[PDB]
Design an enzyme around this catalytic site. Structure first.
Site, PDB file in Angstrom:
ATOM      1  N   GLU A 136     -10.836  64.990 -42.597  1.00 48.45           N
ATOM      2  CA  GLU A 136     -11.091  64.234 -43.838  1.00 48.45           C
ATOM      3  C   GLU A 136     -10.996  62.748 -43.608  1.00 48.45           C
ATOM      4  OE1 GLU A 136      -8.615  65.769 -47.006  1.00 48.45           O
ATOM      5  OE2 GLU A 136      -9.882  67.549 -47.209  1.00 48.45           O
ATOM      6  N   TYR A 199     -11.597  71.047 -54.352  1.00 50.63           N
ATOM      7  CA  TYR A 199     -10.437  71.624 -54.990  1.00 50.63           C
ATOM      8  C   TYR A 199     -10.822  72.006 -56.402  1.00 50.63           C
ATOM      9  CZ  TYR A 199      -7.515  71.589 -51.011  1.00 50.63           C
ATOM     10  OH  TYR A 199      -6.990  71.950 -49.791  1.00 50.63           O
ATOM     11  N   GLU A 225     -12.810  73.494 -45.764  1.00 54.89           N
ATOM     12  CA  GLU A 225     -11.539  73.553 -46.471  1.00 54.89           C
ATOM     13  C   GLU A 225     -11.818  73.487 -47.962  1.00 54.89           C
ATOM     14  OE1 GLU A 225      -8.103  71.047 -45.219  1.00 54.89           O
ATOM     15  OE2 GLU A 225      -7.919  71.023 -47.446  1.00 54.89           O
ATOM     16  N   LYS A 264       4.663  77.694 -48.574  1.00 51.67           N
ATOM     17  CA  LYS A 264       5.062  76.465 -49.254  1.00 51.67           C
ATOM     18  C   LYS A 264       4.923  76.598 -50.760  1.00 51.67           C
ATOM     19  CE  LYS A 264       4.491  71.431 -49.281  1.00 51.67           C
ATOM     20  NZ  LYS A 264       4.092  70.185 -48.531  1.00 51.67           N
ATOM     21  N   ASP A 265       5.852  76.006 -51.509  1.00 48.80           N
ATOM     22  CA  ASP A 265       5.827  76.082 -52.970  1.00 48.80           C
ATOM     23  C   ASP A 265       4.853  75.078 -53.555  1.00 48.80           C
ATOM     24  OD1 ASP A 265       6.426  76.749 -55.580  1.00 48.80           O
ATOM     25  OD2 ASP A 265       8.318  75.644 -55.591  1.00 48.80           O
ATOM     26  N   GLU A 266       3.574  75.364 -53.360  1.00 48.62           N
ATOM     27  CA  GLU A 266       2.498  74.596 -53.958  1.00 48.62           C
ATOM     28  C   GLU A 266       1.410  75.565 -54.351  1.00 48.62           C
ATOM     29  OE1 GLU A 266       1.494  71.734 -50.962  1.00 48.62           O
ATOM     30  OE2 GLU A 266       0.332  73.157 -49.737  1.00 48.62           O
TER      31      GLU A 266
HETATM   32  O1  LIG Z   1      -0.218  66.442 -45.685  1.00 47.91           O
HETATM   33  C1  LIG Z   1      -0.352  66.014 -47.030  1.00 47.91           C
HETATM   34  C2  LIG Z   1      -0.549  67.237 -47.910  1.00 47.91           C
HETATM   35  O2  LIG Z   1      -1.710  67.947 -47.461  1.00 47.91           O
HETATM   36  C3  LIG Z   1      -2.135  68.972 -48.357  1.00 47.91           C
HETATM   37  O3  LIG Z   1      -3.226  69.521 -47.774  1.00 47.91           O
HETATM   38  C4  LIG Z   1      -4.430  68.767 -47.767  1.00 47.91           C
HETATM   39  C5  LIG Z   1      -5.069  68.888 -46.376  1.00 47.91           C
HETATM   40  O4  LIG Z   1      -4.285  68.327 -45.376  1.00 47.91           O
HETATM   41  C6  LIG Z   1      -6.434  68.166 -46.361  1.00 47.91           C
HETATM   42  N1  LIG Z   1      -7.231  68.657 -47.490  1.00 47.91           N
HETATM   43  O5  LIG Z   1      -6.602  68.520 -48.788  1.00 47.91           O
HETATM   44  C7  LIG Z   1      -5.409  69.298 -48.829  1.00 47.91           C
HETATM   45  C8  LIG Z   1      -4.900  69.138 -50.248  1.00 47.91           C
HETATM   46  O6  LIG Z   1      -4.592  67.775 -50.526  1.00 47.91           O
HETATM   47  C9  LIG Z   1      -1.051  70.039 -48.407  1.00 47.91           C
HETATM   48  O7  LIG Z   1      -1.414  71.083 -49.293  1.00 47.91           O
HETATM   49  C10 LIG Z   1       0.289  69.403 -48.808  1.00 47.91           C
HETATM   50  O8  LIG Z   1       1.333  70.362 -48.732  1.00 47.91           O
HETATM   51  C11 LIG Z   1       0.630  68.209 -47.914  1.00 47.91           C
HETATM   52  O9  LIG Z   1       1.798  67.545 -48.378  1.00 47.91           O
END
Ligand SMILES: OC[C@H]1O[C@@H](O[C@H]2[C@H](O)CNO[C@@H]2CO)[C@H](O)[C@@H](O)[C@@H]1O
Length: 300
Positions: A136, A199, A225, A264-266
């Site tokens: 990204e 997303y 992704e 992970k809690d997300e």
């Molecule tokens: O590392 C920061 C954050 O990243 C999220 O994952 C992202 C991925 O690295 C790139 N694409 O977007 C997703 C969502 O923003 C993780 O989900 C978080 O846990 C992490 O803190």
């Protein structure tokens, strides 16, 4: 079975096809950052995903920064474990140089070239491998023409010297959303695809129209992704919009990998706290996101 049947992937008229020229759609899971949740990436978990979810691709998300490869390069060995598992399980595998906070792919370009040299030397005579050279790119100071395309034009030759035609996925601007600019200024290599990430917490109708614009320029797109959550990876689950995207991707032959395989809690995390890192998950061990994603892949 998957890789034996489809074999060598290539791009034909902007579409991912197998070695007999038939369209193929990959659907699978991404790891979360290998420096944080690497325990979920192993032969046994990947076999369970293949057998119980029906995945045909696995994405190894090797963060470069945020405690990843640049800080501790030992994580490359986990990428190797993942690739070897995919080979053994006869599924495809995405090697993801997972830039994010290091928002311009040029920041670690020397390291990227060495990493992709090594990976393509090791695995360049297997059809399983797909190289994702910059997760990204982001920031207003990182554009396709000025930063991303020239980066790709340095890294792709390194790969091609070892692996002349496995697929390479190239990130796009604005966190791999700006497929319009890439599609108007495409790379030369015939087996390139451009990354598009979404997303479901974002209203997606114009983003779908932009993907269609890109497709209409003959650009191939891999949704390397996506999540069911808001763009942060958290903030609730948005299954109605996720389903709209799922249907869109099916209609357009778009391959995808869902973020992410972790406890992970997300909201985007596929697994509940408690889920065994080696697979075998019951329905109660899948999160609402994971339950949905598993259903989508099993339906397919
Ligand atoms: O590392 C920061 C954050 O990243 C999220 O994952 C992202 C991925 O690295 C790139 N694409 O977007 C997703 C969502 O923003 C993780 O989900 C978080 O846990 C992490 O803190």
């Amino acid at each position: 079975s998957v890789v034996e049947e489809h074999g060598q992937l290539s791009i034909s008229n902007g579409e991912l096809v197998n070695e007999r020229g038939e369209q193929v759609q990959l659907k699978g899971m991404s790891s979360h950052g290998l420096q944080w949740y690497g325990q979920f990436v192993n032969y046994e978990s990947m076999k369970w995903l293949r057998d119980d979810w029906g995945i045909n691709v696995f994405r190894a998300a090797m963060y470069t920064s945020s405690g990843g490869y640049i800080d501790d390069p030992s994580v490359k060995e986990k990428v190797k474990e993942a690739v070897e598992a995919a080979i053994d399980l006869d599924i495809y595998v995405i090697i993801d140089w997972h830039i994010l906070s290091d928002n311009d792919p040029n920041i670690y370009k020397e390291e990227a070239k060495d990493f992709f040299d090594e990976m393509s030397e090791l695995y360049g005579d297997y059809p399983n491998v797909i190289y994702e050279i910059a997760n990204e790119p982001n920031g207003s100071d990182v554009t396709w023409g000025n930063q991303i395309k020239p980066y790709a034009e340095e890294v792709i030759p390194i790969i091609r010297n070892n692996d002349p035609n496995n697929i390479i996925i190239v990130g796009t601007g604005t966190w791999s959303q700006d497929v319009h600019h890439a599609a108007d200024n495409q790379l030369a290599d015939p087996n390139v695809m451009y990354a598009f990430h979404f997303y479901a917490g974002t209203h997606g109708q114009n983003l779908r129209d932009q993907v269609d614009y890109a497709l209409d320029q003959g650009a191939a797109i891999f949704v390397s992704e996506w999540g069911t959550s808001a763009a942060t990876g958290d903030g609730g689950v948005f299954l109605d919009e996720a389903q709209v995207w799922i249907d869109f991707m099916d209609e357009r032959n778009l391959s995808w990998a869902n973020w992410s395989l972790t406890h992970k809690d997300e909201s985007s995390a596929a697994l509940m706290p408690g889920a065994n890192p080696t697979g075998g998950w019951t329905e109660a061990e899948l999160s609402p996101s994971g339950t949905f994603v598993r259903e989508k892949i099993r339906e397919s």
